[PDB]
């Protein structure tokens, strides 16, 4: 719901300027006239709308599965980066598997003793749960993943089928991922494929005959294999070397992709025609995600250095950069036509006419359900849980969720967004401060909400283009990451609709090297209010992906991009669990409706279980945070607030008396559409249940303190609208949909303009 | 012992107005003229007078027994609600039964080892107490019930007869229950039948062939059945699904019954002729308890919404609402004739005459015994106790108990209450503020005393109709629960003697729809002093069940309703135990008699063991609270205290000199009857022992401090009456019969009016 004035970008959105991303924040902006072309066929993007539960097998040690989960751990909630996550494992894998001391202790634990050795055709099966139980005390890692990966390693080498009872069920949640590959995200991919080869080494064609070596001649003396497996596992580890530094890998391959993108290819080195012949690199230089990645890297690094083992080495070794990106990563390769399918565009117009208001959107479908579960601990010290989903809370809310989807539908947003801007007798203009552009991108906003950050802090950073130097490492890094996903998503839509583009170097500030940027071209009608550009002949050249977009013509989105619920029901009921806590929330709410009647104030306080009509209260249950559903309402919220914010300061700067009466128009007008929307929600399964409770407790209070006859005032026009809005704000707050901090400022918007028509 | 003036109900007792219960507290009262008829054949009521000890078998897992006990736990003292008690268990049951880690832990403990697995036809039996001992350290739940249901689950599947020597005897107390079904109690019934199917799934034809599958071919390898039982107990769990929400069940079914109770049936949605034919709905729409429950729901919720799974679903599902109600619940179905059998009625009269005083009462019989037991702990950390009942303490008290019943008998109460109210030469009247009605209901009062609340606070809540918002949730929730039982008990009696009735909708407070209320018809004498109503034609229609009751004629109760003692003697002497502690009381008492003689003050202090004539003192023994016997005396107390209270504000507000001399008459008059009663108990096995001990220590004090000859004054008329009354209050307190706070307020009453005739 980010609204921006296309004329002044530096003022309106500094953060979305390409100019910003390449590192020129000065009044000088990228030059509309310069050199070399390119066409992007393909890119790397993750999936939207996927909530999946993935089992971890008996064995089998799936090397891609783990590597994916590692990503999901670093992504969906912060634990360091997948880079820092792997070398925590390597240190772990060394301290345990290569340590024969640990192998003695647990082989002793299975049966029967560390000293006594028995061939023992008598010994029966053992559960994986018992070995994991042992391992939590032996190698106390924070990330419990590590304990499963070693486990099913031993269970792969332990299956003559006698000793290992192949019965357990364990599941992990694969959720939404940030959509586009920031530079370090690529390094995370190379580093993750470092893990694939690492694990696919552990289960091997020689680990399978390791079973077959001890399958002969029968049951054998136990005491040996503790030292054996320890060395068996050491051989598998030493065989996989860190080798090429994953950072340096990405560093250089991008460096060279920039060298053949750039109009300045200096004398000394331009890529070999041999590495130019290397498979897929034709498809690599045509990759948009890799391009934006370059801009990022060179912004932070300010140089790019090469291992110089090429022209030969990385043409032969590695393409495996390609393999690293293709298989392991959540970012899998797509045709650029189909990456923007969920994006729509619509223009307002004047008489001639130029667009007054242009709105870009993602078609999203709301709902379907809101799952409510209660965690159950099987063993202390571990995050292992059954999640019993208790419905009837979920069903209750979900029924109340249905009307919200209809009334907040994105479809309805663009409608109520475009039709507002018109003023009496047209006529335009460059006046009113020009042609507005607003773009909702719930895909982005969900991310701030998943990481427990305020979407409004990133957005603020977009208009201004500066971040607070004070805040701590994990906070700014989360902000910068978020501030990126915006820029990225903009340039994919911008490019997919104008694939023909020009690459040009920059002078540089120093000048040291420079960053490569993009320029578009577009043909249109003659006279432009819109942000400065010629247009000189009905076609126009622009550096900024926003300008490129403002000039397109209305678009119908191809796909609906329906968000989906996680299935707790079918799986989790029988199964164990992943890092759930940071992804869910304690289910509790308190709110109070107060009102003054006849110069006396009554206050009713209300609780969540009272709102759902049950007793008494269950503190143990939690709600799975509905970040996507939340992000859509944010789009409404951020329009309402940020407009009122901008219109107030607009009225001060407007000296003209005829304009101020126009400004003051839009304010009250959209203040009431906000009111009419919430007030509608105030009547629903919860809303009416809420109003009843509030009113009910007030009258009981009015009965004791005095006469009841005052209750007639609750049925007056104004108090009825009052109580209703409150309910609406209360229902949204008690679901994952409205933060109290944001709903508080929502009320202020509703009150900053008086914004109540009594209207008979 | 609640007394009320039938003229003004709102003022005198608001809490018992139907108008209050359907939620109309405004000056407006229900309209005597409106539409549709109905007749109630049946109701749902609990049992009075039952103290039972229930043994828990080896196995066999009686699914109904446990589900009944859950109720008894949540009832007999508050632990949340039986709804919250159940999902504590389901969480427990996941933590234990689905967890193969724990099955391993205990099977290793029973036999023979965790690593080595031996079929072992040699290995012998183990006692259930030992497996339960293990479970107390493994799954440390506060409610020890859970350990038995799991324990004897394994003892059910473990009978090749080899491993379990299944020998122990454990018992639970099934006590008094609230008599009538509040709305959430119905929710509690559905949720308890959810427990029935839950457990009846556990013991199965497939869990026993589980024995029969492994009965072959003989003793088998141990390590296996550890992972096996876990999935076996798991399959049975996933097989019983929560499915339908218990709250949703009741909400919707009552809603539709209301749709066919009401004269207002909108075209749009009225019950289908198909679900109109659905079996049982005939006796359901004719069921009173459901109706008073309906009123409850709509007061608190303020709407009735339907799962709308009908027209189909509730004809097929649920009737199962009925099954939930039939077996599991303590509320089992009764014909409305036989529910009010213990309720009698009697009127006082004036000359013509209309009733001045009408008293409704429950016939109750006292005694027989008062049990005194000393707990014995077999193991720390558990509530398991032998309770050795040491009699001769019990017998000593019971002997003193026999006269108390005689002097406080309900029989005696109704006499001394009706025969007092007459005034000289009749004649009435509507003057004096009309025709009083008092109704004793020990059944209701005992609930407050079992739950360690002052019955007098609920009583307060009846007259005013407001609860203090200050007191904590559980407190008001106990208060509100109690206030329901009063209202409920009235309307079962009102209806049973006047079944022809009319249902009518109400204008509404919101107004959303409205609550259906009741109107009666009754035949009588010509001119009415009694609370406003037409009467127009020798018959009269009234909304309030109290007015309806006044117009009936004296009734003899059918059944005696004798209260019974719990038998500790026969069972517990050999057996372990339930939640006894909150249900018993530490046995210790201290008291002191003080008197001033010749401007000197002497005091003798007395202790409990001294009063029973033994030495030295045993602190370890406890008393089982006689909550019912206490509740009966409450009937007296609340008359004595609360009348003296109202007669005081009566003399102030009385200007008339002829009226005030009458008021002050009633006060001393019944004051002596209180006095004569207490003094009477003062002569008993204990009472006389008290007097002797007190006087003895005083004289012993008079020898040292000075001359003994002053002791002659202790035998004077006045000091003799003093000490006797004291002993009476002292004997009642040292049994469960008088709270010191109320015994103090009884003295204030006895002294507020001078209240001593010397009378030779």
From Swiss-Prot, chains A, B:
<comment type="function">
    <text>P1 is the major inner capsid (core) protein of the polyhedral procapsid, which is responsible for genomic replication and transcription. Forms a dodecahedral shell from 60 asymmetric dimers. Binds to RNA and may be involved in genomic packaging.</text>
</comment>
<protein>
    <recommendedName>
        <fullName>Major inner protein P1</fullName>
    </recommendedName>
</protein>
<dbReference type="InterPro" id="IPR048856">
    <property type="entry name" value="P1"/>
</dbReference>
<keyword id="KW-0543">Viral nucleoprotein</keyword>
<dbReference type="Pfam" id="PF20837">
    <property type="entry name" value="P1"/>
</dbReference>
<keyword id="KW-0694">RNA-binding</keyword>
<keyword id="KW-0804">Transcription</keyword>
<keyword id="KW-1141">T=2 icosahedral capsid protein</keyword>
<keyword id="KW-1153">Inner capsid protein</keyword>
<dbReference type="GO" id="GO:0039616">
    <property type="term" value="C:T=2 icosahedral viral capsid"/>
</dbReference>
<comment type="subunit">
    <text>Homodimer. Associates with the polymerase complex.</text>
</comment>
<keyword id="KW-0167">Capsid protein</keyword>
<dbReference type="GO" id="GO:0003723">
    <property type="term" value="F:RNA binding"/>
</dbReference>
<dbReference type="GO" id="GO:0042802">
    <property type="term" value="F:identical protein binding"/>
</dbReference>
<dbReference type="GO" id="GO:0019013">
    <property type="term" value="C:viral nucleocapsid"/>
</dbReference>
<keyword id="KW-0946">Virion</keyword>
<dbReference type="GO" id="GO:0039625">
    <property type="term" value="C:viral inner capsid"/>
</dbReference>
């Amino acid at each position: 719901g980010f609204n921006l004035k296309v004329k002044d970008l530096n003022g309106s959105a500094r953060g979305l300027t390409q100019a910003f991303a390449i590192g020129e924040l000065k009044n000088q902006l990228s030059v509309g006239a310069l050199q070399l072309p390119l066409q992007f066929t393909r890119t790397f993007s993750a999936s939207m709308t996927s909530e999946l539960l993935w089992e971890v097998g008996k064995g089998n040690i799936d090397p891609v599965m783990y590597a994916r989960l590692f990503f999901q751990y670093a992504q969906a909630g912060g634990a360091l980066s997948v880079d820092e996550l792997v070398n925590q494992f390597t240190e772990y894998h060394q301290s345990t598997a290569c340590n024969p001391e640990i192998w003695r202790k647990l082989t002793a634990y299975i049966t029967g003793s560390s000293n006594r050795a028995i061939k023992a055709d008598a010994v029966g099966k053992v559960p994986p749960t018992a070995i994991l139980e042992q391992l939590r005390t032996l190698a106390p890692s924070e990330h419990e993943l590590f304990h499963h990966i070693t486990t099913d390693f031993v269970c792969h080498v332990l299956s003559p089928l006698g000793f290992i009872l192949p019965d357990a069920a364990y599941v992990y949640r694969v959720g939404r991922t940030a959509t586009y590959p920031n530079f370090y995200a690529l390094v995370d991919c190379v580093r993750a494929s470092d893990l694939r080869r690492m694990l696919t080494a552990l289960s091997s064609v020689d680990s399978k005959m390791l079973q077959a070596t001890f399958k002969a001649k029968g049951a054998l003396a136990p005491a040996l294999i503790s030292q054996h497996l320890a060395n068996a596992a050491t051989t598998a580890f030493e065989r996989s070397r860190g080798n090429f530094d994953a950072n340096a890998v990405v560093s250089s391959v991008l460096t060279i992709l920039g060298r053949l993108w750039s109009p300045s290819t200096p004398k000394e080195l331009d890529p070999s025609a041999r590495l130019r012949n290397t498979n897929g690199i034709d498809q690599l230089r045509s990759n948009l995600a890799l391009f934006i990645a370059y801009q990022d890297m060179v912004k932070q690094r300010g140089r790019a250095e090469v291992i110089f083992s090429d022209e030969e080495l990385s043409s032969t070794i590695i393409p495996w950069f390609i393999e690293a990106m293709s298989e392991v990563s959540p970012f899998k390769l797509r045709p650029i036509n189909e990456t923007t399918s969920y994006i729509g565009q619509t223009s307002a117009i004047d008489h001639m006419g130029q667009p007054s208001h242009v709105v870009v959107y993602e078609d999203w479908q709301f709902a379907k359900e809101i799952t409510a579960f209660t965690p159950v601990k099987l063993a202390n010290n571990s995050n292992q849980r059954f999640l019993d989903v208790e419905p009837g809370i979920s069903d209750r809310m979900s029924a109340t969720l249905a009307p919200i989807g209809n009334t907040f539908a994105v479809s309805a947003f663009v409608k109520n967004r475009t039709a507002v801007y018109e003023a009496v007798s047209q006529r335009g203009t460059v006046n009113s401060n020009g042609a507005e552009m607003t773009l909702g991108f719930p895909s982005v906003v969900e991310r701030d909400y998943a990481l427990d950050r305020d979407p409004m802090v990133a957005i603020a950073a977009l208009r201004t283009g500066i971040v607070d130097e004070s805040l701590e490492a994990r906070a700014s890094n989360d902000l910068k990451r978020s501030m990126f996903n915006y820029y990225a998503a903009v340039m994919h839509y911008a490019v997919a609709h104008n694939p023909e583009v020009v690459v040009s170097e920059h002078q540089g500030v120093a000048a040291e090297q420079g960053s490569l940027y993009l320029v578009w071209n577009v043909r249109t009608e003659l006279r432009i209010p819109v942000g400065y550009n010629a247009i000189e002949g009905g076609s126009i050249r622009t550096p900024e992906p926003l300008e490129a977009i403002a000039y397109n013509k209305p678009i119908q989105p191809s796909e609906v991009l329906q968000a989906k619920v996680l299935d707790l029901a079918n799986h989790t009921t029988s199964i164990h669990i992943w890092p759930w806590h940071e992804a869910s929330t304690e289910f509790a709410y308190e709110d109070a409706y107060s009102v003054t009647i006849r110069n006396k104030r009554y206050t009713a306080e209300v609780k969540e279980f009272e709102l759902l009509g049950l007793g008494q209260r269950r503190e143990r249950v939690r709600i799975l945070k509905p970040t996507v559903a939340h992000a859509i309402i944010q789009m409404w919220y951020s329009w309402f607030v940020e407009d009122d914010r901008t219109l107030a300061a607009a009225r001060r700067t407007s000296r003209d008396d005829a304009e101020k009466l126009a400004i003051d128009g839009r304010r009250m007008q959209n203040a009431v559409t906000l009111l009419r929307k919430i007030e509608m929600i105030g009547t629903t399964g919860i809303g009416a249940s809420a109003v009843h409770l509030a009113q009910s407790r007030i009258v009981d209070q009015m009965a004791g303190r005095g006469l009841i006859d005052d209750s007639s005032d609750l049925h007056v026009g104004i108090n009825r609208h009052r109580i209703r809005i409150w309910a609406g704000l209360a229902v949204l707050q008690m679901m994952g949909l409205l933060s109290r901090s944001e709903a508080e400022a929502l009320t202020k918007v509703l009150g900053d303009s008086n914004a109540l028509g009594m209207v008979v």
